[PDB]
Amino acid sequence: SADITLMNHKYMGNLLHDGVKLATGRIICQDTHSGFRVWINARQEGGGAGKYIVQSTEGPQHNLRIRIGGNGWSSFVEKGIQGVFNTIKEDASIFYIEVDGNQQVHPGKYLFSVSGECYIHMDNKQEFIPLCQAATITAQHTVEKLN
Amino acid sequence: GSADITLMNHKYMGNLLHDGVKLATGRIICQDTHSGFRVWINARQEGGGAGKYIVQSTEGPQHNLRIRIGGNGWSSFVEKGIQGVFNTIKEDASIFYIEVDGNQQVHPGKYLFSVSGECYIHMQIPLCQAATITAQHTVEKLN
């Protein structure tokens, strides 16, 4: 079961090169895992689907195209398997929200939503199944003496 | 999508435990959309067949109790790679039993049953609400 954080990165200017970091994220999992999986909660451009698109709110309403970035993160190219993956067995991983393609982005307020989990690689894929604490309970049974 | 699991112990007289006797009654709930349930015991395994288990008395491993998960509708995979028992119940709740596995003269004592479970989505996935977080970013120009 993962803990995820996302921290805005302030930036002056709107001629944004591809790769420019707009937020810094971290995912943590204490339990044993094969790696991490993170994704953006946003509509994708025309299917595609296309690049993650975020529309500004509470003011001018324009579009910004974003992706997850950072060393170690990989995306599966055959459609069907959403998000980015890494193979870090360590407990913590950094990722970024980055500008996806050179963009002159209109001034405004843009909300990034991301989700994430750790996964445990499975033979008989299956592939990578997510990793959460199962509900658990105990009961004690007494076997009585013979007498 | 976390399950809620209860386990009710049943009292019996004496230490001759016949195969199939229900030592505990379990119930597993999943209030969200799911294809079925999966349940297992956190105990060592005899590897006899499937879902079978060996529980030690609270005093230590010098005394064993052999048990299995039972109940209509529950299945286990024949290969060791996937553990526990599964069903294909889409309803909120599923009932299972911890049963005596084979006729046994059991050493008097206390035996702790630890049971875990999850609701799954058929797609070898468990239902785990992924952690989620937002941050707001302002785009602005100098002038």
Residue numbers in the entry:
A (entry chain B): 0 to 146
B (entry chain A): -1 to 121, 125, 128 to 146
Please quote the paper that reports this structure.
Here we present the X‐ray crystal structure of the AAF/IV tip protein HdaB at 2.0 Å resolution. It shares high structural homology with members of the Afa/Dr superfamily of fimbriae, which are involved in host invasion. We highlight surface exposed residues that share sequence homology and propose that these may function in invasion and also non‐conserved regions that could mediate HdaB specific adhesive functions.
